[PDB]
Amino acid sequence: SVPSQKTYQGSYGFRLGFLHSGTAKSVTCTYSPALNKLFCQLAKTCPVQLWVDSTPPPGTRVRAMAIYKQSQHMTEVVRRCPHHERCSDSDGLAPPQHLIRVEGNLRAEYLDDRNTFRHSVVVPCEPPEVGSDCTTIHYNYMCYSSCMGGMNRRPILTIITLEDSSGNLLGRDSFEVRVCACPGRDRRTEEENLRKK
């Protein structure tokens, strides 16, 4: 099975937002709107914003899952490589196999799907802090795109779904991810390639 990646705002007008972090060689996480692609360093904080037009019901949750982007790989489960799944860098909550973690949220839950075997991490949907207009979730990606025996240079997408308390679909958005040593340079390069192409 391949989970849908269709953008769907749904009844609550759900969509993601990203900061404008620039492309300096020192930057650790940066988003390209032109590529709809997040570039980040291994295990570093990735702020992702949640925006809605109206308040969803109590019990609404927000799930993140990775899938391979390319058609010939979309069916393979995205997981950490044989090295990283064994490096004992657990935060006490995330299974060591999971590529995507949520940072600093005690209510995060990690799912190994009993049928598809796909991994995901889900948290309660919460209102913005007083004074803010959106809610931010901090994600970590725990392997490099290049990890041998894992992603092995294959591009992935992160799919973010807004769910009701049963896990039914309320909204969906997605973005490509590259986990790399120099996100600033790589974003600049890929945006240049795009502009040329």
Q: Which residues make up the interface to ligand P86 (CB under 6 A)?
A: 50-56, 125-128, 134-135
Query: Would you say 61 or 84 has its CB closer to Zn ion?
Result: 84
- Both tokens of residue 10? 């749904």
> Which partner, Zn ion, ligand P86, none, binds residue 18 by CB below 5 to 8 Å per kind?
none
Distance between CA atoms of residues 66 and 179, nearest Å? 12
Query: Quick one: 29 or 50, whose CB is closer to Zn ion?
Result: 29
Please choose, from the candidates 111, 195, 115, 197, the residue with its C-alpha nearest in 3D space to the C-alpha of residue 161: 111
Q: Shortest approach of Zn ion to residue 151 CB, angstroms?
A: 8
Residue tagged 């949640």 (tokens): 50
Q: How far is the CB of 11 from ligand P86 (least distance, A)?
A: 12
Shortest gap between Cβ of 142 and Zn ion (angstroms)?
Answer: 7
Task: Give the one entry of Zn ion, ligand P86, none that residue 147 binds, where binding means its C-beta sits below a cut-off of 5 to 8 angstroms depending on kind.
Answer: Zn ion
| Residue 53 per-residue DSSP state | S
Please provide residue 38's backbone torsions phi and psi, each rounded to the nearest 5 degrees. Answer: -90, 135
Q: Which is nearer to ligand P86, 8 or 69 (CB)?
A: 8
| Cβ at position 161, least distance to Zn ion in Å | 25
Would you say 85 or 173 has its CB closer to ligand P86?
Answer: 173
Contacts of 163 (CB under 8 A, 6+ apart): 60, 61, 62, 63, 122, 169, 170
Residue 143, annotated ligand binder? yes
Of the pair 150, 184, the CB lying nearest Zn ion is at 150
The reply, when asked if residue 81 is annotated as ligand binding, is: yes
84 is in an annotated binding site: yes
Percentage helix, strand, coil for the chain under 3-state DSSP, each rounded to 5: 10, 35, 60
| Contacts of 193 by beta carbon, 8 Å cutoff, 6+ apart | none
Q: Give the footprint of Zn ion on this chain (CB under 5 A).
A: 81, 84, 143, 147, 150
Binding-site residue numbers for Zn(2+) are 81, 84, 143, 147
